[PDB]
Design a protein around this ligand. Structure first.
Ligand SMILES: Cc1cccc(N(CC(=O)N2CCCCC2)C(=O)N2CCC[C@H](C(N)=O)C2)c1
Ligand SMILES: [Zn+2]
Length: 140
């Protein structure tokens, strides 16, 4: 679990969204595994606006933050799951790292701010849903 809190927005994995998230929906995209809802309080996270390919992510199954090198956002095949059918998940970045299906939501960050959140994993890989192209998170 985990979310990004920027301005009056809460960014979570679409497959982990609550009823309150759906009742206060701003935007969602199943192909990216992202959902954004509105908040009453203002958040403290800042979004990175860069093309960094190195950063650090939080892994809840180890209570640790790990430095990683990660690929550029791409269309990668995600196996059928209990959340989605076999499909191409878009805007996904891969790295070598530990992940379990409770690690989703952990933040990946660089020197510029938040880059994305854990969305996929297994066999010593971890995938992150990028948010750096969602310029609207910085306003309104
Ligand atoms: C973070 C992480 C670590 C390990 C595994 C996963 N799994 C696979 C998985 O949940 N399982 C159950 C256990 C072993 C078999 C497959 C994923 O990549 N998922 C699940 C959640 C939705 C993801 C998506 N964004 O499409 C795909 C995730
Ligand atoms: Zn950066």
């Amino acid at each position: 679990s985990g979310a990004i809190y920027v301005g009056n927005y809460r960014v979570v994995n679409r497959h982990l969204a609550t009823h309150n998230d759906w009742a206060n929906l701003v935007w969602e995209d199943s192909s990216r595994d992202l959902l954004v809802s509105s908040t009453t309080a203002q958040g403290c996270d800042t979004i990175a606006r860069c093309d960094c390919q190195t950063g650090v992510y939080y892994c809840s199954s180890r209570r640790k933050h790990y430095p990683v090198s990660f690929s550029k956002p791409s269309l990668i095949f995600v196996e059928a799951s209990e959340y989605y059918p076999a499909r191409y998940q878009s805007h996904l970045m891969l790295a070598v790292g530990h992940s379990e299906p409770g690690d989703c939501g952990g933040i990946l960050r660089c020197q510029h701010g938040v880059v994305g959140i854990v969305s996929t994993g297994g066999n010593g890989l971890v995938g992150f849903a990028d948010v750096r192209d969602l310029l609207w998170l910085d306003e309104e």
